[PDB]
Amino acid sequence: KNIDGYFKIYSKHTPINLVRDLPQGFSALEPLVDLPIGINITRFQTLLA
Amino acid sequence: FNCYFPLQSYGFQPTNGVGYQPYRVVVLSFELLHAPATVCGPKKSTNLV
């Protein structure tokens, strides 16, 4: 997300045994980094390998 | 004739007068833009009670 020119990230990593779709459970994400960038972001792209 | 090379070299020798002695100048340009502020002065952090 980007709010008031401050881009924020919330990261959570937990192991799960999954096949397709998603598991059923509750999760609370935690801060990762704060990036006072302040640029307009209208779109994004996922980079793969 | 009527054609010259604009760049000229500064004569530098230790025997030159103090007035013409080379001086290294560092010019700091302070500009406040619409972007957020980062660089700030030092801190204090006095004793705790």
Side-chain angles (χ1 to χ4, degrees), chain A residues 8-26:
Chain A
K8 294 176 179 177
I9 296 170
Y10 299 135
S11 178
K12 183 180 172 62
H13 182 197
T14 187
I16 191 66
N17 187 339
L18 181 64
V19 177
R20 299 290 182 270
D21 291 345
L22 293 173
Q24 184 173 355
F26 178 80

Side-chain angles (χ1 to χ4, degrees), chain B residues 9-23:
Chain B
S9 296
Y10 294 96
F12 290 158
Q13 294 179 337
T15 59
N16 291 337
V18 176
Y20 296 140
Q21 293 177 336
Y23 296 143

Side-chain angles (χ1 to χ4, degrees), chain B residues 29-43:
Chain B
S29 178
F30 296 159
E31 295 178 351
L32 178 63
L33 296 175
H34 60 284
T38 59
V39 176
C40 298
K43 301 302 287 185

Side-chain angles (χ1 to χ4, degrees), chain A residues 5 9 13 16 19 21-22 25 29-31 35 41 43-44 47:
Chain A
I9 296 170
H13 182 197
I16 191 66
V19 177
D21 291 345
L22 293 173
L29 277 63
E30 294 177 350
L35 297 174
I41 297 165
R43 293 177 65 83
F44 59 90
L47 296 174

